[PDB]
Amino acid sequence: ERKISRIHLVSEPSITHFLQVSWEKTLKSGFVITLTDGHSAWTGTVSESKISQEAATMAMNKGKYVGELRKALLSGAPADVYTFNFSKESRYFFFKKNLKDVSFRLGSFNLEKVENPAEVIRELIDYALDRNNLLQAELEELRAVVEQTERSRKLAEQELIETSERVQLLHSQNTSLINQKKKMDADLSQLQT
Amino acid sequence: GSGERKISRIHLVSEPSITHFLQVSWEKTLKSGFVITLTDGHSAWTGTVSESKISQEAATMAMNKGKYVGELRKALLSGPADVYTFNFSKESRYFFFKKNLKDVSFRLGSFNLEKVENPAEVIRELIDYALDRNNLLQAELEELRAVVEQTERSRKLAEQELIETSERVQLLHSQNTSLINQKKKMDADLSQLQT
Amino acid sequence: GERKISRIHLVSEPSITHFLQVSWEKTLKSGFVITLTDGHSAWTGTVSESKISQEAATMAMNKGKYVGELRKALLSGAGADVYTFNFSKESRYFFFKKNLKDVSFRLGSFNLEKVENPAEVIRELIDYALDRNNLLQAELEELRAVVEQTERSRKLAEQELIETSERVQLLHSQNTSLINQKKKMDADLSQLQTEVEEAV
Amino acid sequence: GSGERKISRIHLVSEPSITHFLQVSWEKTLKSGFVITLTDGHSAWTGTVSESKISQEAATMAMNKGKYVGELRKALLSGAGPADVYTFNFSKESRYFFFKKNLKDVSFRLGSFNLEKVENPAEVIRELIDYALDRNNLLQAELEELRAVVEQTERSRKLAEQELIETSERVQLLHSQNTSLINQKKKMDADLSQLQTEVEEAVQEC
Numbered sequence: 179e180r181k182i183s184r185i186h187l188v189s190e191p192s193i194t195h196f197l198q199v200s201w202e203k204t205l206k207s208g209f210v211i212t213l214t215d216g217h218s219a220w221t222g223t224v225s226e227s228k229i230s231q232e233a234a235t236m237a238m239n240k241g242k243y244v245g246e247l248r249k250a251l252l253s254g255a256p257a258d259v260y261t262f263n264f265s266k267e268s269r270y271f272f273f274k275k276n277l278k279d280v281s282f283r284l285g286s287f288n289l290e291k292v293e294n295p296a297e298v299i300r301e302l303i304d305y306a307l308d309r310n311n312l313l314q315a316e317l318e319e320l321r322a323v324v325e326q327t328e329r330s331r332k333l334a335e336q337e338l339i340e341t342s343e344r345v346q347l348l349h350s351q352n353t354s355l356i357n358q359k360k361k362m363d364a365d366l367s368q369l370q371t
Numbered sequence: 372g373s374g375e376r377k378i379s380r381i382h383l384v385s386e387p388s389i390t391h392f393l394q395v396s397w398e399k400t401l402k403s404g405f406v407i408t409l410t411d412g413h414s415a416w417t418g419t420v421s422e423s424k425i426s427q428e429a430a431t432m433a434m435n436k437g438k439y440v441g442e443l444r445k446a447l448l449s450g451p452a453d454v455y456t457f458n459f460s461k462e463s464r465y466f467f468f469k470k471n472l473k474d475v476s477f478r479l480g481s482f483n484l485e486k487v488e489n490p491a492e493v494i495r496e497l498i499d500y501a502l503d504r505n506n507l508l509q510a511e512l513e514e515l516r517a518v519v520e521q522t523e524r525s526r527k528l529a530e531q532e533l534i535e536t537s538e539r540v541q542l543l544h545s546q547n548t549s550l551i552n553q554k555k556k557m558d559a560d561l562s563q564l565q566t
Numbered sequence: 567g568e569r570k571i572s573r574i575h576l577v578s579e580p581s582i583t584h585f586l587q588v589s590w591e592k593t594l595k596s597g598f599v600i601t602l603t604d605g606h607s608a609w610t611g612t613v614s615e616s617k618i619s620q621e622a623a624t625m626a627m628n629k630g631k632y633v634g635e636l637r638k639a640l641l642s643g644a645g646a647d648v649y650t651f652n653f654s655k656e657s658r659y660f661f662f663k664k665n666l667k668d669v670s671f672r673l674g675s676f677n678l679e680k681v682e683n684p685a686e687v688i689r690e691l692i693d694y695a696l697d698r699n700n701l702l703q704a705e706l707e708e709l710r711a712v713v714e715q716t717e718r719s720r721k722l723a724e725q726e727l728i729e730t731s732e733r734v735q736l737l738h739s740q741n742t743s744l745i746n747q748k749k750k751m752d753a754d755l756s757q758l759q760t761e762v763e764e765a766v
Numbered sequence: 767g768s769g770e771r772k773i774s775r776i777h778l779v780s781e782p783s784i785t786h787f788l789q790v791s792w793e794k795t796l797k798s799g800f801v802i803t804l805t806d807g808h809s810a811w812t813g814t815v816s817e818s819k820i821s822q823e824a825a826t827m828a829m830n831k832g833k834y835v836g837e838l839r840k841a842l843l844s845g846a847g848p849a850d851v852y853t854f855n856f857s858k859e860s861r862y863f864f865f866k867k868n869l870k871d872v873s874f875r876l877g878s879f880n881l882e883k884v885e886n887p888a889e890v891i892r893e894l895i896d897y898a899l900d901r902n903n904l905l906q907a908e909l910e911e912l913r914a915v916v917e918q919t920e921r922s923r924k925l926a927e928q929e930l931i932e933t934s935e936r937v938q939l940l941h942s943q944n945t946s947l948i949n950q951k952k953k954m955d956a957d958l959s960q961l962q963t964e965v966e967e968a969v970q971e972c
Contacts (some may be wrong), residue, residue: 193495196498204708216490216492216494217490241705244708245702249701252704254847255848257700296412313505313508314508324515335529345539348543348544353544358554359554361783364556366561366564372837372874373828489783496869507833514835520794521794524841571899585895592871605888641960688807692895696775699905713915714914731933734901737937738940748954765968765969
């Protein structure tokens with residue numbers, strides 16, 4: 179599981195930054211958050227115990243806290259109500275939620291600077307290109323399913339009108355047969371004398 | 372809306388360790404020219420292949436220009452018949468052979484890519500574009516999963532109606548053969564009762 | 567940040583559907599801000615904690631029982647088929663009662679002054695509901711992942727239990743046929759053990 | 767199945783302070799046509815974009831219609847990013863258009879629709895609020911049901927796994943007897959020749 183977001187930090191408002199969050203099937207089980215500005219990178223890990231501690235700090239249901247994390251760190255910057263800020267000196271990444279004249283902090287994470295930003299960026303670029311090819315193949319598969327279903331429907335429309343011509347040609351045969359059956363069945367009592 | 376671009380993974384034999392990325396961007400056709408950008412996560416190299424340059428490279432190989440640009444489309448826009456190489460000193464020439472396992476390789480192209488002085492902006496522009504195109508494909512999928520859902524239900528609508536009719540023809544066909552069997556017995560009894 | 571929005575049916579204007587927004591702290595008995603709107607204007611007032619106790623003592627019922635009735639009335643539906651809501655648009659008084667058998671008694675009465683920023687309040691109310699939807703829909707993405715994760719573990723658990731049960735059936739029959747082979751080979755040894763001593 | 771609808775908050779450039787709300791409703795497929803509704807909390811504007819208008823704007827942009835409809839899905843549905851810039855004329859009460867701004871200062875008019883004021887905007891807002899509160903109940907009901915599926919599936923997982931800890935114990939102890947019986951058979955085979963060749967050595971001794 180992996181999602182790359184385009185966030186806008188208050189520290190450097192000019193340079194648009196990228197936020198890569200990676201976890202395993204559940205965000206409440208922990209995740210790895212990466213911040214990159216195209217040259218250097220900052221990667222930190224948020225454990226399951228840290229999420230429960232941050233949720234218990236501001237008095238919030240853990241299910242509702244992960245909902246806020248999955249809404250601020252994964253949707254991107256849709257949902258501009260979140261104010262992201264990363265201090266490069268202290269190497270801390272904190273974001274807050276803005277509405278109703280209240281800007282309370284929602285999370286405080288410690289992202290340490292990576293000594294191999296080239297590999298981190300190339301792995302990010304490689305994942306974005308792999309997700310691109312997957313969505314392209316799924317589009318070609320889906321387009322093939324549409325032309326097969328419509329083709330299968332058109333065949334089902336023509337087989338029905340042929341079978342409907344057969345259901346009435348055969349229903350008229352039973353009616354023509356049951357008439358002489360009932361006519362001969364009464365004629366069998368006449369020959370009985 | 373204008374602008375066309377394809378980003379590809381390339382294996383540079385100069386640096387076989389890492390995997391380089393090639394960003395080819397052009398207008399509407401490769402015949403008019405294209406801007407080719409090479410990056411490695413830290414630095415970036417960009418060159419502008421003019422339309423005249425493609426004509427010279429196609430003429431020096433005695434190859435039809437329409438066939439030559441077909442090979443440029445083949446190598447730079449997909450992703451190993453083609454082998455790529457690039458030198459880091461100053462002779463910044465992104466040249467790629469077409470190693471054809473028929474006999475031996477031969478030169479296919481060569482362009483000058485100068486090292487840009489803002490590689491961070493190039494990479495962000497490269498990453499930002501890749502994310503935007505993934506959202507467009509994801510939206511195109513949501514639009515298409517709704518079309519296939521509508522055609523499937525309309526298909527199964529006519530499918531159950533055909534099976535409903537095809538079941539009925541087999542109903543009054545075994546019933547038709549039943550009436551044939553009854554009139555067959557009444558025919559035999561008409562001859563036995565004739566006596 | 568506890569807030570609840572619910573639609574109400576005013577008997578003074580029964581043709582339209584008004585909306586009620588109750589905002590309160592951690593506990594409703596401590597007080598709440600009650601907002602009313604009709605899609606154009608809005609009226610909002612404040613119910614202090616002492617106003618709750620004064621209303622509770624005015625009808626001689628326990629405070630906790632009264633705040634419980636406030637959760638049933640001011641929260642979770644209306645028009646609901648038991649509580650009758652009414653708002654005097656002239657007097658700016660929010661008055662609601664509870665219908666029983668043949669006796670309907672007043673449950674609360676609070677003053678709501680008209681707000682000077684009706685579009686801003688509606689703009690805040692819509693922004694909140696859309697924000698809570700994006701929050702609940704994010705919890706569905708998390709919880710659907712938990713279902714698929716638990717479904718996978720259960721499915722392989724039943725699959726493994728089926729194989730381990732089918733293994734004990736092939737194995738029990740294999741031992742059954744093996745005890746019989748052991749039974750017949752013992753009868754052949756005593757036959758050959760005799761022929762050794764008998765042919766001496 | 768009711769209808770398809772999405773309500774997103776947008777920030778116009780004619781009034782960047784207040785938060786306008788954008789309501790787009792369609793029937794299954796977006797290319798079939800949709801209805802745009804703009805509101806600020808007082809007045810409201812409603813427009814109707816048919817299937818023909820979508821093909822016309824797609825022919826002007828020279829894009830594939832599937833891409834243009836996909837580009838409309840990104841901007842209109844769930845729109846709150848700096849990629850798409852929205853604009854609307856209040857005094858001219860017409861021409862709601864939106865751009866697509868990316869890096870290197872590239873901008874093109876992605877859409878242009880003329881929506882007109884509503885005579886009764888209060889009823890439009892109440893209907894918008896009524897829908898938002900209905901999905902709030904529909905989502906919270908889907909959660910309570912999903913919470914029951916999680917613990918029920920965890921119940922069946924613990925049950926089959928504790929029955930596994932009993933079934934597996936019988937398999938291992940039954941397999942230990944299998945190998946113990948095969949070894950007795952193998953040794954009983956070897957002890958059958960020493961008796962067979964001994965009988966044969968008695969008849970080969972006259």
